[PDB]
Design a protein around this ligand. Structure first.
Ligand SMILES: Nc1ncnc2c1ncn2[C@@H]1O[C@H](COP(=O)(O)OP(=O)(O)O)[C@@H](O)[C@H]1O
Ligand SMILES: [Mg+2]
Lengths: 56, 77, 371, 56, 188
């Protein structure tokens, strides 16, 4: 019984850790992807600016 | 018959100044102000915050290494 | 009170209160019913998404424009678009605001009469006035003469004006516009392997056309250069990945404007219908029209068109006249800016078609003195 | 016995998973920071350009 | 298939009752390998994978590389002679049949359900496979809730508890008027 109680508690703690880590990963992923899209957009508008310079 | 427009007084080509010269300077200055404030708010704070998060990440790495090593030491049977 | 300067257009509805610089709400004019079945219950699924909402759910809709070539082919959808424009994009009830619609030249009468009948019966405006889309674009330039080429998305028309006196016998209306260029681009993209068929993917091809295509200064030299080097191939990322590379399709899509034989149209390009429109005018105002050629409308935003057109007209015109092409940076909203200026005038304040006048003469009042 | 065997086994899986998750988290965060720093370097390139534009 | 590959070590289960024992073995021991060839090479050299299990009468058995070969059939249905492609490629094919504008959302919201998706390590193998197939720009996310087994029933409870759904039931008088073929009609 003692071993069972300790094991169950350790398991539950680790499980909740797992869930929270997943949520953190998701949020950081969303922010990083938004930054990535921002970077692609800035580079593309930069190139458009370069081509505008080429025009004039 | 085609419509007949009643005769007025004035004007035309005199609102081009009052709609062009305004934004010719105000818009440029305001956009420069916006760019300056946005860069100041964004870039330095982002780099500092990323450094802070990196330091916290290194501390988490140290804690993970210590816990993993002590648990592997005990559990090794 | 303030006037509502609406501008139906064909492809983008532009609206806003009179007296400002830019339209308040600009959104595509498409009404798309859902086409699949739908299994989630209580999701709150509507029966028709209009305006900019249907450009985000376009994956499961069948978008259909209610205005084909200037004329309106589906009156219920157009009424829905107007209702959306008034109530959700501006949030001003029409019972307390005059309206100033715009209409292409040489359009069917029934279209205009139905438009005024709707505005007076359904929305119940105090007074509405219909204006030709080119005179407004001439207002916005601050000129009073000049020949304006308003190449919209539905129809391209070329109205010459001198000293405020329009020349009704010299209007050359041509039905090639941005939509036909989108279809032709979608048709020549198939030469590399990319097939766009669905009415939703027409929007993707339109975005490709807007972001990549440009008008070549000299067509044969560009065709020769693109066939030897590879300095032109610009890539573009679809809404799901799988980037595509556009080669000499870049300047072949908008070249259709100057050679309408590409899409099988007989008529001459926009470079020669302007010269023909000028030559129909009297012999003493041709110099002023040559010097004050005005560009407007969305489709005239291609990078490098203000030079190609000037080169072509200089080739056609006599060598002594000076050819100048006015291409303001605010080309897209030029018609609406002109509409705002016209609605803000004091001299114009008595030209509205007041409701009591409509009650006495019926919808045919629009063709009468109140034009 | 069945219960505690199950619990310890699934807990071990949890520990290995969570450690893999932590490696993933660190790699993602550091890559995010590197990309953000590249972006800020680009922003300061643009800011030098804006200082030039101070010519207007 | 697990009952068929266990015979390679000497354990023969034939009776329809012993199929239940093989099912218990599959539930408790099998797992999905992240990379198949590396696992096949590792299990053939070391012995860190051999997990033992006690039958309902004693005589413990030791499962070697049968552990990750049983559920690998999902991603290579050629093992049991089926022609079709695995569950990693029929999802990508199902996505590609959809319209071009909703593929990003489907990529980002891939949902797993059902009992058989409870193998330890499947939510990573499937994500790796789809990321290999899909374009490099799209983000691939696999939703694997811990209550996977009863997901269908929880959803059924939620749907039955809705007020908007309360008038979609096939009332008995309707069945009396149109016969059993009422189910294909509007009341789906
Ligand atoms: N920046 C651009 N470059 C090239 N073509 C454009 C651009 N913007 C708009 N267009 C084309 O012009 C059309 C919009 O024209 P618009 O002036 O809105 O028509 P309308 O006269 O009906 O308002 C779009 O369909 C598009 O094909
Ligand atoms: Mg227009």
């Amino acid at each position: 019984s003692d071993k069972l109680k300790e094991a169950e508690t350790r398991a539950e703690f680790a499980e909740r850790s797992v869930t929270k880590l997943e949520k953190s990963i998701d949020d950081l992923e969303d922010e990083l992807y938004a930054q990535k899209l921002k970077y692609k957009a800035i580079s593309e508008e930069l190139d458009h600016a370069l081509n505008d310079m080429t025009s004039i | 018959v085609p419509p007949k427009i009643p005769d007025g007084e004035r004007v035309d080509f005199d609102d081009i100044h009052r709609k062009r010269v305004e934004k010719d300077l105000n818009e440029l200055q305001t956009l420069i102000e916006a760019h300056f404030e946005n860069r100041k708010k964004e870039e330095e704070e982002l780099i500092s915050l990323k450094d802070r998060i990196e330091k916290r990440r290194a501390e988490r790495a140290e804690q993970q290494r210590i816990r993993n090593e002590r648990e592997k030491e005990r559990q090794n049977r | 009170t303030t006037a509502l300067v609406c501008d139906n257009g064909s492809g983008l509805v532009k609206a806003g209160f009179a007296g400002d610089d830019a339209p308040r709400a600009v959104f595509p004019s498409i009404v798309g019913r859902p086409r699949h079945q739908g299994v989630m219950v209580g999701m709150g699924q509507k029966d028709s998404y209009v305006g900019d909402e249907a450009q985000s759910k376009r994956g499961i809709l069948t978008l259909k424009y209610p205005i084909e070539h200037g004329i309106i082919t589906n009156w219920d959808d157009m009424e829905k678009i107007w209702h959306h424009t008034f109530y959700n994009e501006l949030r001003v009830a029409p019972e307390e605001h005059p309206t100033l619609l715009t209409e292409a030249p040489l359009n069917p009468k029934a279209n205009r009469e139905k438009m005024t009948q709707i505005m007076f019966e359904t929305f119940n405006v105090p007074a509405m006035y219909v204006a030709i889309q080119a005179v407004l674009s001439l207002y916005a330039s601050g000129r009073t003469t000049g020949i304006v080429l308003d190449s919209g998305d539905g129809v391209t028309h070329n109205v010459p004006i001198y000293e405020g006196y329009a020349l009704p016998h010299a209007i050359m209306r041509l039905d090639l516009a941005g939509r036909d260029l989108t279809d032709y681009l979608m048709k020549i993209l198939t030469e590399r392997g990319y097939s766009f068929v669905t009415t939703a993917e027409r929007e993707i091809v339109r975005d490709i056309k807007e972001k990549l295509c440009y008008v070549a200064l000299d067509f044969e030299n560009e065709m020769a250069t693109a066939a030897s080097s590879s300095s032109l191939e610009k890539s573009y990322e679809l809404p799901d990945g799988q980037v595509i590379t556009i080669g000499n399709e870049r300047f072949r899509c908008p070249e259709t404007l100057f050679q309408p034989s590409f899409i099988g149209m007989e008529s001459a390009g926009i470079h020669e219908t302007t010269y023909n429109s000028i030559m129909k005018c009297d012999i003493d105002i041709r110099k002023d029209l040559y010097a004050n050629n005005v560009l407007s409308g969305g489709t005239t935003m291609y990078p490098g068109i203000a030079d190609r057109m000037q080169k072509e007209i200089t080739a056609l015109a006599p060598s002594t006249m000076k050819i100048k092409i006015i291409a303001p940076p605010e080309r897209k909203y030029s018609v609406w800016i002109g509409g705002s200026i016209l609605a803000s005038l004091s001299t114009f304040q008595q030209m509205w078609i007041s409701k009591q006048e409509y009650d006495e003469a019926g919808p045919s009042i629009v063709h009468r003195k109140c034009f």
